Amino acid sequence: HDWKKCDQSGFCRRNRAYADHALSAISWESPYKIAPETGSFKDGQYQAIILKTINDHGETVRLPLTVSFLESGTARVTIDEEKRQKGEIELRHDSKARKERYNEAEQWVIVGGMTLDKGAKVDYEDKTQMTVKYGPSSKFEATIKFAPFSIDFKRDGASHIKFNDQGLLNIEHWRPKIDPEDDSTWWEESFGGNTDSKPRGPESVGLDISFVGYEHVFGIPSHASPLSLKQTRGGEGNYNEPYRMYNADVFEYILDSPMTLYGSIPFMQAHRKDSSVGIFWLNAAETWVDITKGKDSKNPLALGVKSKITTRTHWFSESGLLDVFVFLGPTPKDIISKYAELTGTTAMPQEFSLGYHQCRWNYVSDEDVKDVDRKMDKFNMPYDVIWLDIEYTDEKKYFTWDKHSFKDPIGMGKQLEAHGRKLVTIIDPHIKNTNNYPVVDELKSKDLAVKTKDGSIFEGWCWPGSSHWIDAFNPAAREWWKGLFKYDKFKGTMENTFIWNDMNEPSVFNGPEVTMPKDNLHHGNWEHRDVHNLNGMTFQNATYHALLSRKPGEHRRPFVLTRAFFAGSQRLGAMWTGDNTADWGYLKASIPMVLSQGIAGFPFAGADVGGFFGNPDKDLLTRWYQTGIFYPFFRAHAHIDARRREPYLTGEPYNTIIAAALRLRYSLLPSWYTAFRHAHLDGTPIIKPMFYTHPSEEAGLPIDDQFFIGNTGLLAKPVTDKDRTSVDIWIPDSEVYYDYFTYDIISKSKTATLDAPLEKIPLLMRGGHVFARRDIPRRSSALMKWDPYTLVVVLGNDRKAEGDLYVDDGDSFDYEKGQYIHRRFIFDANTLTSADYEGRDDKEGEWLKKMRTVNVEKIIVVGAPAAWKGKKTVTVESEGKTWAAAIEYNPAEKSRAAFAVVKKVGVRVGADFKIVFG
Template sequence: MTPSKAWSAPRWTTVVVVLLATLCCLFVPALGVKHENFKKCDQSGFCKRNRQFADKAAATTSWTSPYALDPTSLSFSDGILSAVVLKTVKDGQEKVRLPLKVTFLESGVARVTLDEEKRQKGDIVLRHDSKARKERYNEAGAWALVGGLETSKGAALSDKVEEGFTKVFYGKGGKHQAIIRHAPFEIDFQRDGETHVKFNQRGLLNIEHWRQKVEKPQEEKKEGEEAKEEEKKEEAQGEDESTWWEESFGGNTDSKPRGPEAVALDITFPGYEHVFGIPEHATRLSLKTTRGGDGNYKEPYRLYNADVFEYELDSPMTLYGAIPFMQAHRKGSTVGVFWLNAAETWIDVVKPKSIPNPLSLGVLRHTDTQTHWISESGLLDVFVFLGPTPQDLTRQYGELTGFTAMPQSFAIAYHQCRWNYVTDEDVKDVDRRFDKFKIPYDVIWLDIEYTQEKKYFTWDPLTFVNPTKMHKQLDKSERKLVAIIDPHIKNTDNYPVIDELKKKDLAVKNKEGNLYEGWCWPGSSMWIDCFNPAAINWWKGLFKYDSFKGTAPNTFIWNDMNEPSVFNGPETTMPKDNLHFGNWEHRDVHNLYGLTFHNATYQALLERKKGTIRRPFALTRAFYAGSQRIGAMWTGDNLAEWSHLEASIPMILNQGISGFPFAGADVGGFFGNPSKELLTRWYQAGIYYPFFRGHAHIDTRRREPYLAGAPYTEIITQALRLRYQLLPAWYTAFHEAATTGAPIVRPNFYVHPDDEKGFAVDDQLYIGSYGLLAKPVTKEGQSSVDVYLADDQPYYDYFDYTVYQGHGHHNIPAPLEKIPLLMQGGHIIPRRDRPRRSSGLMKYDPFTLVVVLDKDGNAQGTLYLDDGETFEYEQGAYIHRRFSFDGKRNSLSSSNLVDRVTVKGENYLKTMAKVRVEKVIIVGAPKSWRNKKEVVVMEEGKKESARKKTVEMEWFEGGKGRADWAVVRDPKVGVGRGWRIDFD
């Protein structure tokens, strides 16, 4: 939520303060984002300085980077190269020592860190009242990284000695090479002898080193001298010191006790035209340039988690989350970098053009992508990935920051939400009406109004009279409830939570070291500091059933406003000179705050009750690298407009390739009232979001699917049933993400990495590894869509088996009742076809296998199953099968993908013993089967007499551009056992 509604507050004076501070957002119609509330690069001192630094370097033909590696400091041991980089300052009179470490990891990833040599006490003059740490923040990795840091045993210095260079071979078979130039300091990262990533090629490396603050005496100016003074400043040579020690914006002043400490570096991807990633921005998948050119951005991409009211589209402006992971892609190669820094960060992207060869007749082509990364504080800490495939990058990044948490099965079904369901009777009525209209759903959500006076861990006694009874009604249909809990704690009397927060000293502090007080929904509030381990332990206790009374095992949590959003703070967030645990300034950790709060909630849900532990579900709005280990995210407060529906597709695709695939957007749009056509089309698109939730603002009209009326309710219901029908495929895709880092929904370049024409395609998506290609309708009045096919395999319409084949665009009918969905030949898709009220009621339903033959008559697919609730899958309690159709033998088989058999695994197999495959559909069935009436089925684990049997088969002719198909009904084979069906 974003400020748009009044809140309760303890005194009239404080109400006036809050109203004045947030007037731009309160009681006004939707007017769009308030740009004046958020900085541009020129208004952010460190960004402006480094952009000017870049301009100076570009304008000087003789520019040389002032950074050089001291060769006498070099050492190499156990996969780690250490040295000192010297920064020349003050016309060569001073050298700043910057310890360098290049770590070569067993995975083939390289890590480069550049710090600043620790100064002795007294070397730096800080504000006398500052409690901030003097050294650079170096703990981002403790939150973001969980593995993949084993150093390479095979990394080795080159035997060839070359003056001015140091070379290291690393990676599998020594195919990677880091070439480190000493003066000026540069690094080239090569794969198979070709450079793919270059550090400091343009000489924009800039570590703003520690320096003493010199208090200049104030001179009395005579009349008329002010203008002359300004002229002198403009003419002065050297660095702009105006924002070194203090900076103001929007009426707020940021004290900077440590002075300027930005880190910046240019990173070039030679030969790469397309770069992706660095979410969260409302942009296309392939990132635009930010410095010049028609249709491109004038501002850098900004990463600074913020509560942006009614965010605009096609913009590099910051949003709610930050993942500083960028990929560059071209035919045959994908590489990338991960900029491990949690401070405010800006990224320029430039794509210079050059003539590729003398015979090109003047035709210009992009050959390089040049990026410029600028962070306000912290270390320079960068991971380099050399691929060569998109799958390599997502796996290696996941090994470092963690793979997606395996959710409970209900979490990937449909969620029904609005701000707010106003009473417990309202919740129960919505639940009953979904059943009345036979519309499936799994989760209903509560926003802030369920609390008593915006006090979290309470229920409003007048409106939520009996939350236990409400939970019990939901539980009868295996449904869940999600309640919102935000990081701001109401600062009021007679509220034990705030009393304990203060007593235990667990809140964020201001620059003087006192408890920080700001304003949010409750009025005066304080913010829990989850960088403090004691705060996490305290937070865990608040969620226990005897503490948060009225909750139950089917209660889960939504973390909103955790950027953190502060209504009266600079840029609607917390002052940068606030202090966190360990006396780190907020500027150092800002982009991590949301992750730490989300993590505390996840830990709390794990410990609610002793005994069998259920997997937590916790949604977050703010995030950082590593948040994927904890739960889901959504794209925040979008608008009920066609353009926002269209933008949701590339935004969610970008989340997926950036390591956080459990992503969604508010179906229907948060602000405003969608037309019935828009609402219907949004549901048809939303069924392809990994996180699928309908949500709306409190001032919008109610829009539950059953209210739309004919034919819209029926069409939306059919879309929802399609999502539920394909839940086995979705759950298997989640398992793949949780074990390999692969996106759940995938852009064209990820599936077809050699198809150059499709690299920028971002309005369609593939679901998991199933060849399911969806193209949502995102334009008003549209009755057909152009789907881009990147290969020459046959693609079949999911519903009527119409065949589309051939590289390029194909027009597909899409009247309102039609969902454009194709099946790529070569895949086997598992589904559950029986309509149920919730996913929990489908647990023991039989399966249908849709075998979609490729042009050679083959197909493959997998199915992953576990109990959908606990962590027992980690002890082997799961089913993982591979299905294969061999076109030469005309046989379909099921084989085991489980590596080991455990007691838990055997027990789980017993619970699933009666779950069977009830139907097999062969799409693209050979015409030679026309007269075939039977198939032979053989199953493992049965008595000899029952192992082989004959089952009926029916063949159907497609006609009119449709494929032929065949159906085997009830082959009587168990989903957890091996079997084979012979069609010849």
């Protein structure tokens, strides 16, 4: 129950000291050079040898350099160590650990984007340096300098990203332990009851990466920190330790800290007015990032001499390859979408998983679960899923049920099924070490468990007491795991059961930093140090593949929630921010956290509604529902000591405010699902910060308490302070904005003050958009499946609007073969049209045929033009038929906009149409 500070992490100490030395020496030079005559360029790839000078004799070691220029416009830079590629080192303690630098992070993370640009070309190439042109129309440049090695990445007439400009490149080369630079952290190190045997010695890789002319950087979740990341080298308002990524189970984590949490995505972006760039540091080991805001001059300067403000970052990882992608944008969308091409888009979710999820530690019996389910219906509060935490098990053995408390799990399951609701059951990677437990027998006899430094089976303490851990790095373990989840094997589960993966950092209660020893061995004989941040992801991968098919002929979308994660985990399911606390500061903090998830390419994120630890006041709980309806993943959860707080227990009038928030979420589900579709199509974030939506607006850059929802133009700013009855929203631009609920015109960019009592959600509509909703409330999202849609057409300054709507069966992979509806809606010049979003042509399966009776029935035009007054019909054309529908026009009145409503449109949602107004 204690965490290394940066001084207690030996390689973090060494790398920070490397920086101290470089930054305060007389013209320090990085002792790294390209031997230019080893250099060659062909078919988008530079290759050379970097020679590192390792002492004052001028002795060198060889560090192979690859620079790839990819068809996307992304560059990749990789540096390995030739001695280790060749096995020409010797490990201590007779370790069987691998000698080479871990190089399988690509294979877990990268799924596309790797095609080389044959059109990239050397432009200039003297004996000191070369410049390669690349990217679209050859407008990107990388200047590689030989001696000392550096790279400058350019576009639009300037450097944007520099490698090694401050000279902090550090590859710790292999060296023996001999007798006669401080070496006291090179070998064994001790912390948290444990001693790391360190069989390879020092092997970190680090680099300074400068964002030239950028004042704001973003990313590297997960941290309780602002969206715009802080400096880390001390000073007023700054942190003093670097941001850390080392997935860990951190009990009662605190606010506003660079300390590591449960997952890590080593992806950073930098944004200024109309320019974006980014890097992705692909390394699965413990990683720290120092951030300082500085100037583009390395020297002391004369009075009055100007320098560009520059964010200097210093990245270092315990082991592995130095392996970095460089993204030159120029837009926020460009960066995220290229990142998603490399590491994966958001998986198509089970549609139900966008609804409201009801959980706590624990619902104590099948009867407790059935009672909660009935009470939600009794109090008219919609929900989709109820969740079973660890107490459903028999003595913390996974794949069992406590048959005292959970006597009829199938019956419970069927009750949920009657309203198309689901059940989620927790399954963790620690397998109880006990007898009469076939799962642990098989884990052992198939050799599927994680091992110690000497190859024996690792054993440690978690919820079941003594336990072993599945090694999901091993394909054979993943394939075995798959077998355990078939409905015929995992008795008591059925088609509406899905899975929660927890404790997959991995959390080991008597381990150092509550995790595994660094010298544990995984499949391939990698050390745990090599792969630690990938561990959670391997486990979620295993569970995802298990849910694709759990009986013959089934092929469907998994739902898996994870705690620990890495780059790529967006392909596998959802995350939440772990064990937060029932307090106002944590409510406020949840929004910048969830946003940082999205801009780092894993948007399917949320935080526990109400807070995990403690007991929220009624007003805190109420406001948390109003925030939580904007989390892509929306779940209430509560610690074992917290009082029962199922939402109907709050009492009136809170119950009503809570139900209204739930119903708002449900009514917007068509639009929410469409936002997930775009996340799937090209990694577009689900909720979007102001730097993403409005890159032209400098004042937007740091803002992290408001956001847009997908493609709807809905701008939300939830209330997150105690006792507040107004809210100040930053209006990003000159478009017209309208209150969602009252249609009041909210009164160019600037701060608007709005009324926001407890019962009110601050939600505005931007002009220029169309979004879909479903107005009929229902008990769950499944009972909405066949209901009609309302389109809301929000008109701005230009009398134009556009938007879209994606629908499919929510469950299958039939969308891969075209079995879906995706409409683009355009309003222009008194006409609203619907066309296929991609412009497709023809063959209809069952689901699509059934959608022929599901209609758009209502259209609301907000800001309807005065010319429409007294016209009482519109004309509708679709599929070579024509008819009239009634429209009522409502004039502007007081602060409220004019609005018109078309009634009984009567058009099937899958059909092209044109509606002519005025």
